[PDB]
CSV table of C-alpha atoms and ligand atoms in Angstrom, one decimal:
chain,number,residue,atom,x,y,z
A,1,UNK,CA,-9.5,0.4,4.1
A,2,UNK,CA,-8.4,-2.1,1.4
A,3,UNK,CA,-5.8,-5.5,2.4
A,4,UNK,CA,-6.1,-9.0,2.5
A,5,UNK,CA,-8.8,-10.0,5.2
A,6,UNK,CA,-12.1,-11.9,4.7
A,7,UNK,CA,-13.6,-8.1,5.2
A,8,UNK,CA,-11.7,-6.1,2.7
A,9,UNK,CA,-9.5,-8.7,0.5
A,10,UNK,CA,-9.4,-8.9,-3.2
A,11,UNK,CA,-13.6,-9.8,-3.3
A,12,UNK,CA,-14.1,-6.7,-1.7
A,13,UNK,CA,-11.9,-4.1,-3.6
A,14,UNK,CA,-13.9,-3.9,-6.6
A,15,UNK,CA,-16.4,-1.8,-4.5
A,16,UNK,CA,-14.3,1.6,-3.5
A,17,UNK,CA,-12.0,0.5,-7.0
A,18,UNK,CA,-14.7,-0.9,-9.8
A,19,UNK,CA,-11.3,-1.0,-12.2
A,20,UNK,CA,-11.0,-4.2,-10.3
A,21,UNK,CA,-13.5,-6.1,-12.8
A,22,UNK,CA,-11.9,-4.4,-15.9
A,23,UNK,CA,-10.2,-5.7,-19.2
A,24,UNK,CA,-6.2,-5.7,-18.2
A,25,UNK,CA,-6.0,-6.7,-14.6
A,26,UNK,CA,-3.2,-8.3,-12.9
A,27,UNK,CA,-2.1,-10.6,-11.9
A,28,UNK,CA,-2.8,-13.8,-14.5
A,29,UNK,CA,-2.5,-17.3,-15.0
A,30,UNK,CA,0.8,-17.8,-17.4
A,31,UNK,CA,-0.6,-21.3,-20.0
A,32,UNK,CA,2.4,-22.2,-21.1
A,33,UNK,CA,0.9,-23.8,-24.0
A,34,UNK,CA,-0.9,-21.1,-25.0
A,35,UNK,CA,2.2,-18.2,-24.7
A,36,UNK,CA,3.7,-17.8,-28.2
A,37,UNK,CA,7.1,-17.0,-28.6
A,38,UNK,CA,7.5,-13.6,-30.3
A,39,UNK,CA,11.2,-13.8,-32.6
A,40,UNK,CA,10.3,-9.7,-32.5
A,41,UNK,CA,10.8,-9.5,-28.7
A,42,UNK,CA,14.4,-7.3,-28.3
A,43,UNK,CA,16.5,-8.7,-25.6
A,44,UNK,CA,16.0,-7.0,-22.0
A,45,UNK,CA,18.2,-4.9,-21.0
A,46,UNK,CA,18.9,-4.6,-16.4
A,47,UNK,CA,20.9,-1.8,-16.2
A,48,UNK,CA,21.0,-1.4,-12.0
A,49,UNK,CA,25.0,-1.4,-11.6
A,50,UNK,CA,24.4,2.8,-10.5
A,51,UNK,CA,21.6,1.4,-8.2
A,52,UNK,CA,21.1,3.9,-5.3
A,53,UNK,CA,18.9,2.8,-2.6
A,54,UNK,CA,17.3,5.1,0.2
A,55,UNK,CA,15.0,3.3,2.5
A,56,UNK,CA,12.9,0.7,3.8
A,57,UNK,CA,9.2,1.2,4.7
A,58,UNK,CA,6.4,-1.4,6.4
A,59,UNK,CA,3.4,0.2,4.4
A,60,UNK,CA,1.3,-2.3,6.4
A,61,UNK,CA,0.5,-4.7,3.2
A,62,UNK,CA,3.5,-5.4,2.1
A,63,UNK,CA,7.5,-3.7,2.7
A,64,UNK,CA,9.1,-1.8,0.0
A,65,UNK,CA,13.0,-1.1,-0.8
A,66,UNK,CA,13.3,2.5,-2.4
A,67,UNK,CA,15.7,3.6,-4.5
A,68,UNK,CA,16.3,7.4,-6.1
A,69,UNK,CA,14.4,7.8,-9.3
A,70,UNK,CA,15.5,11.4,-9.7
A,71,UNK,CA,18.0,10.5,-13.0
A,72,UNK,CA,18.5,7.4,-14.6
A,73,UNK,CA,20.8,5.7,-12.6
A,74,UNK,CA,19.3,1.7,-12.5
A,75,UNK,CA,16.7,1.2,-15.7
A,76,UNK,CA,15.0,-1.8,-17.6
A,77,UNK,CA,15.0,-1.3,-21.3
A,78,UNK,CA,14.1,-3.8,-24.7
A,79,UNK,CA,12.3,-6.4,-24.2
A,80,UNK,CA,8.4,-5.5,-25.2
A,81,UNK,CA,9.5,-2.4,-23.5
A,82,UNK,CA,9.6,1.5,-26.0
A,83,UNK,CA,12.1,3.9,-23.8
A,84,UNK,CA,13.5,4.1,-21.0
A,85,UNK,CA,11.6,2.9,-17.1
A,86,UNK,CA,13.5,4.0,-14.0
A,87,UNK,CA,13.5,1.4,-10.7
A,88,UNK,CA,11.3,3.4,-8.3
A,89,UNK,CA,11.1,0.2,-5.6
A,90,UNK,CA,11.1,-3.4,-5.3
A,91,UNK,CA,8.4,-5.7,-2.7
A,92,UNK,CA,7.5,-8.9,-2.6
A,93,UNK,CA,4.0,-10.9,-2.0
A,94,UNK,CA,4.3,-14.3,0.0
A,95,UNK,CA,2.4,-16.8,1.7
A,96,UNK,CA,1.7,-18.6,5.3
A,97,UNK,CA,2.7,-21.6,3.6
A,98,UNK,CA,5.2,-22.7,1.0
A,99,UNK,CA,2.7,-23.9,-1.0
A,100,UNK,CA,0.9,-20.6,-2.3
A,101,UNK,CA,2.1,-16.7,-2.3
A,102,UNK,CA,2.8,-15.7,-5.7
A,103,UNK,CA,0.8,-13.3,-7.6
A,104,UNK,CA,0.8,-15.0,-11.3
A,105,UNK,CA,0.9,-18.7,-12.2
A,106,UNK,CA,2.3,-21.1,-14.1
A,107,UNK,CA,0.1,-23.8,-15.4
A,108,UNK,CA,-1.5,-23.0,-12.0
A,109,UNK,CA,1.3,-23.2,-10.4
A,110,UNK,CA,2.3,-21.2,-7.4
A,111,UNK,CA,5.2,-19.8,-6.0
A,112,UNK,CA,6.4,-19.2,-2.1
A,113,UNK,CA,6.6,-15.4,-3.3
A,114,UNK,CA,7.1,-12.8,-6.1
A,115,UNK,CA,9.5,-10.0,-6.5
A,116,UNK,CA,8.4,-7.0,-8.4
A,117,UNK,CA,10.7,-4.2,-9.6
A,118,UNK,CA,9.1,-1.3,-10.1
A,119,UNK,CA,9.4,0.8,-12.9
A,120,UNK,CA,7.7,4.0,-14.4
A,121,UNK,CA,8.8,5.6,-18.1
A,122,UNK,CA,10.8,8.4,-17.6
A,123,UNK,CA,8.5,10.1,-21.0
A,124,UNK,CA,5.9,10.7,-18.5
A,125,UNK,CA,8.5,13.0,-16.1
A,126,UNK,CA,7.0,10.8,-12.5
A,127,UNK,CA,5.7,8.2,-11.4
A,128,UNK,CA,2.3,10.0,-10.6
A,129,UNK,CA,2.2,10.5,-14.1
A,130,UNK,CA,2.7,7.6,-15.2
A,131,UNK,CA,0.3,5.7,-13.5
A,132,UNK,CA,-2.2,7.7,-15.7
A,133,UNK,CA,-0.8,6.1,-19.1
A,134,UNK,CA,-1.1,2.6,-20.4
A,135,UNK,CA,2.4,2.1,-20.8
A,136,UNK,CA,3.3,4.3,-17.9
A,137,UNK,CA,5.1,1.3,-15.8
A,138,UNK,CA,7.1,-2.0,-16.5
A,139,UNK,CA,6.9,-4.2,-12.8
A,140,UNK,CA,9.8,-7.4,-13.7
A,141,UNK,CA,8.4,-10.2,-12.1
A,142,UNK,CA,10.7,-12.8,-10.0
A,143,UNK,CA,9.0,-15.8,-8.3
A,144,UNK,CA,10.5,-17.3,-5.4
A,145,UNK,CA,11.0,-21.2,-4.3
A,146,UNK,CA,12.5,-22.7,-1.4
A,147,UNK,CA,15.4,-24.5,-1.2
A,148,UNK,CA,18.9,-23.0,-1.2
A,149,UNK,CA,19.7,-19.6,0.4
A,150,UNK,CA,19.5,-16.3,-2.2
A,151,UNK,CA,22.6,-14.3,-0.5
A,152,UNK,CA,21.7,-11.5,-2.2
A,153,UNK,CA,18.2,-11.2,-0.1
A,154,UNK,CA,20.1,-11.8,3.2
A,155,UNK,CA,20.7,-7.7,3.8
A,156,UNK,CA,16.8,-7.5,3.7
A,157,UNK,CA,16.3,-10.5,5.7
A,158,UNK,CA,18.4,-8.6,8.8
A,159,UNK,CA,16.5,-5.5,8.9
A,160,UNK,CA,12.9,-6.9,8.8
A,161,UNK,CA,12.8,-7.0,12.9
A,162,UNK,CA,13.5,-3.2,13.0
A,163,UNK,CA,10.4,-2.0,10.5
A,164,UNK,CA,7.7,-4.9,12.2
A,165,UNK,CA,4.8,-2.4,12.0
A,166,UNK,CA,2.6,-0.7,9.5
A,167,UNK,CA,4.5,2.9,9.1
A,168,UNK,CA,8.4,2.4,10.2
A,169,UNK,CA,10.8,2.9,8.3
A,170,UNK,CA,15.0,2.1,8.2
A,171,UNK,CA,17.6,3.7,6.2
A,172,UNK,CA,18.6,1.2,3.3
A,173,UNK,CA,21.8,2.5,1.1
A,174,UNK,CA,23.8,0.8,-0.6
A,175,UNK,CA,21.5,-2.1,-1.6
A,176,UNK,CA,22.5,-3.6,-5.0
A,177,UNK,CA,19.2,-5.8,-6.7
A,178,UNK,CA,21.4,-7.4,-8.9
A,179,UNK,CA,21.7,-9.9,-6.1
A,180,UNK,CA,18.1,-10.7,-6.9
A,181,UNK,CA,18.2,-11.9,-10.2
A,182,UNK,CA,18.3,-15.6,-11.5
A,183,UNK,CA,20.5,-16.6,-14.2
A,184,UNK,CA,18.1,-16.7,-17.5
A,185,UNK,CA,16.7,-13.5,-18.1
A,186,UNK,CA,13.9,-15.6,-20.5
A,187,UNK,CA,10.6,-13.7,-19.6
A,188,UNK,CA,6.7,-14.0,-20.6
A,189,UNK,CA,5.3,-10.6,-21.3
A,190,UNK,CA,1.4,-8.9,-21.2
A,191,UNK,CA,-0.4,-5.5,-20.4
A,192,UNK,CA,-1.7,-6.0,-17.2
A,193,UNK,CA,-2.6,-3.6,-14.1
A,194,UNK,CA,-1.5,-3.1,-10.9
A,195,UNK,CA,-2.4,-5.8,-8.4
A,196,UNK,CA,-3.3,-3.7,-5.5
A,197,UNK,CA,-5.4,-1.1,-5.6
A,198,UNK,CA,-5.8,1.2,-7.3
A,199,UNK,CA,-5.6,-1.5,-9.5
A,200,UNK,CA,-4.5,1.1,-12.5
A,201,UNK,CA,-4.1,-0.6,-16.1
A,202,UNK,CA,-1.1,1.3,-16.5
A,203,UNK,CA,1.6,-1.8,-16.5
A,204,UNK,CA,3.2,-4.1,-19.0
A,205,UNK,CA,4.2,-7.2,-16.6
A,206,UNK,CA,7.5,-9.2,-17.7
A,207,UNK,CA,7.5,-12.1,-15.5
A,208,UNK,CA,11.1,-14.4,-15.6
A,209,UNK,CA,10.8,-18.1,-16.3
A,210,UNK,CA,13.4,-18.9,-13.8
A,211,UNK,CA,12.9,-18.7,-10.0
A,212,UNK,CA,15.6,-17.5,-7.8
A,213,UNK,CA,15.7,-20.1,-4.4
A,214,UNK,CA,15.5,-18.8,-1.3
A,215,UNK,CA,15.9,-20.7,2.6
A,216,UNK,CA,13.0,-21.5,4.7
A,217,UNK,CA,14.5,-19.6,7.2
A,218,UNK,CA,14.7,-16.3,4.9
A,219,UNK,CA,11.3,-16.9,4.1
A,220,UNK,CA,9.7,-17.6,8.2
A,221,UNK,CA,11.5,-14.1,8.5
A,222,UNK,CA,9.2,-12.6,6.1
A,223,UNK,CA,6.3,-14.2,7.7
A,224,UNK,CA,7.1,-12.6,11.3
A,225,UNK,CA,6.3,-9.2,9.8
A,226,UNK,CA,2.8,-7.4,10.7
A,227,UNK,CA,0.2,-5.7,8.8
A,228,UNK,CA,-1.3,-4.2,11.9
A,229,UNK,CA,0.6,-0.6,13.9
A,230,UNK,CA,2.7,-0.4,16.8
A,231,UNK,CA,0.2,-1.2,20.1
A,232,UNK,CA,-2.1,-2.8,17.5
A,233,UNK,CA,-3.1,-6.5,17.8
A,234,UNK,CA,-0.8,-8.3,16.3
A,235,UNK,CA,-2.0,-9.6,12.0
A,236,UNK,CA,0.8,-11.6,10.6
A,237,UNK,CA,1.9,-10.4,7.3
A,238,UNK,CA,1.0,-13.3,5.6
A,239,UNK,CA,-0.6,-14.0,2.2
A,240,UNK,CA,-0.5,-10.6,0.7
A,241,UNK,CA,-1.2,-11.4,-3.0
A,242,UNK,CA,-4.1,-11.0,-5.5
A,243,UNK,CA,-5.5,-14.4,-7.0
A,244,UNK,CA,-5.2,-14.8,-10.8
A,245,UNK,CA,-7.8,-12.3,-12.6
A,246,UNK,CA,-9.6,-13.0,-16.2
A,247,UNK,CA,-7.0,-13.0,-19.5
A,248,UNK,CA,-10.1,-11.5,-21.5
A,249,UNK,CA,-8.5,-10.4,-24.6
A,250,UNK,CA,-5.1,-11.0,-24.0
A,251,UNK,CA,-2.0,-12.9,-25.8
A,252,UNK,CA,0.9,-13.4,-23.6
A,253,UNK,CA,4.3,-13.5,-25.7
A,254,UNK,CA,7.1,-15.7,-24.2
A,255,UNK,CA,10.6,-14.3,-25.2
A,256,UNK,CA,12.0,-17.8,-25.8
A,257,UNK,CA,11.8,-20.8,-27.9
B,1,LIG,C1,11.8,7.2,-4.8
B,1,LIG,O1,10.6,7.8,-4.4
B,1,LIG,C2,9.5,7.0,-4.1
B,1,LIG,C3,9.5,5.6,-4.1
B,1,LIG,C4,8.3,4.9,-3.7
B,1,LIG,C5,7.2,5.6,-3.3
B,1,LIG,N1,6.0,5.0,-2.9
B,1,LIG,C6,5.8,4.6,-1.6
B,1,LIG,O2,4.7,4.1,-1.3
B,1,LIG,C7,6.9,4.8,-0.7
B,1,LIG,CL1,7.8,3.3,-0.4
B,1,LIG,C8,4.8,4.9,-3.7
B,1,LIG,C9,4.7,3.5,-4.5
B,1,LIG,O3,5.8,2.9,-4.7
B,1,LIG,N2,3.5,3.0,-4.7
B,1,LIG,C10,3.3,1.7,-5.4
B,1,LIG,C11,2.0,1.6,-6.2
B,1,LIG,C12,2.1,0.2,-6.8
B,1,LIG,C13,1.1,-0.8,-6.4
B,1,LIG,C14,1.3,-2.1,-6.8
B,1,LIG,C15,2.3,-2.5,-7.6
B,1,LIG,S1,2.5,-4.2,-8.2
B,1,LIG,N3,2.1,-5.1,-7.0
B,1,LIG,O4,3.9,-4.3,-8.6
B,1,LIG,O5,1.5,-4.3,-9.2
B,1,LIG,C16,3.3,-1.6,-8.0
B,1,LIG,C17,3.1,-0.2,-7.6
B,1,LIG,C18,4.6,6.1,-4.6
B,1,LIG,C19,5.4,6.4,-5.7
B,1,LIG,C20,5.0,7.8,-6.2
B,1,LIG,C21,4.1,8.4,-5.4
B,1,LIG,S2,3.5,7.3,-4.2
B,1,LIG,C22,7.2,7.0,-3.3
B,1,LIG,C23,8.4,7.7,-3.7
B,1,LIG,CL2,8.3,9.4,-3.8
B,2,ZN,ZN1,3.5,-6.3,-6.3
């Protein structure tokens, strides 16, 4: 099956997934120099103060935080953005090295890691659903430098040694991503896809201009995760992202001057 190995990395998905080579895939390369501001962009709207999160989960390609999507209880709104999209999860991608681990670029330019929030529109009833539909999610995208400690990513930190392995799971209430956020919400904005398979062009991608810091020891804990099972060989969970995929016809708007 699909991850990030010589033998069935991003070269290989196209195979079982041919979306891979299509028109709107994720993620890209942000020009800054070619990304127009857009006075018609609304102001986003992070509405995540009734935030409940559930769980944590080792999926065995990356670890997502879960939250209830069953009302509309934490929501991004305006921006690019029609209606309302309900947080479903947030992960991250990250690297072996500082140096790379991010899933877009800036001016070629990469990150440590990238945050995505997860969110699907609620006119489309799940997330299932959604998925099928060109506007069916909005991921906000968060890249991640080191330097200073993110407090608000410490609670994560502390339970990565109890979900190691592909397919355990912790309990993870009470969780509030608002301590993930930087400062600026400025954003660039563009359709895009999913950028792990099934690689569905079912996302508009709103990626923040400002990174949030986080400690090289928050990020080595990261790195001590593994994509391989209990009594499996150990396979660091390192460099887990997608490389930057063709803009084809594609304008990305920046939401500032
Ligand atoms: C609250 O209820 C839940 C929350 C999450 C889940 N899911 C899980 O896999 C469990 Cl963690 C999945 C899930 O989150 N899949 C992610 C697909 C995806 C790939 C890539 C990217 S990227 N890199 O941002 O482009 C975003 C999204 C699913 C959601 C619905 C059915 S399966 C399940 C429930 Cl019912
Ligand atoms: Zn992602």
């Amino acid at each position: 099956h699909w991850g990030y190995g010589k033998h069935n990395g991003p070269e290989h998905w196209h195979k079982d997934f041919p979306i891979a080579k299509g028109e709107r895939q994720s993620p890209v390369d942000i020009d800054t120099h070619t990304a127009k501001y857009d006075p018609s962009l609304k102001p986003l709207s992070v509405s995540y103060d009734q935030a409940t999160s559930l769980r944590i989960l080792n999926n065995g390609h990356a670890f997502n935080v879960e939250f209830d999507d069953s009302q509309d209880k934490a929501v991004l709104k305006g921006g690019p953005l029609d209606g309302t999209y309900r947080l479903i999860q947030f992960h991250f991608h990250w690297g072996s090295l500082d140096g790379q681990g991010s899933e877009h670029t800036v001016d070629k330019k990469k990150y440590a890691a990238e945050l995505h929030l997860v969110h699907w529109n609620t006119k489309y009833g799940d997330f299932g659903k959604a998925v099928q539909q060109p506007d069916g999610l909005a991921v906000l995208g968060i890249f991640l430098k080191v330097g200073s400690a993110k407090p608000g990513l410490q609670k994560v930190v502390d339970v990565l040694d109890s979900i190691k392995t592909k397919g355990k799971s912790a309990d993870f209430t009470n969780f509030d991503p608002r301590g993930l956020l930087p400062e600026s919400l400025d954003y660039w904005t563009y359709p895009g896809s999913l950028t792990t398979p099934p690689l569905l062009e079912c996302v508009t991608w709103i990626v923040l201009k400002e990174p949030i810091s986080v400690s090289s020891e928050q990020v080595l804990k990261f790195r001590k995760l593994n994509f391989n099972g209990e009594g499996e060989p150990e396979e660091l969970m390192v460099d887990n992202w997608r490389p930057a995929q063709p803009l084809k016809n594609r304008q990305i708007k920046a939401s500032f001057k």
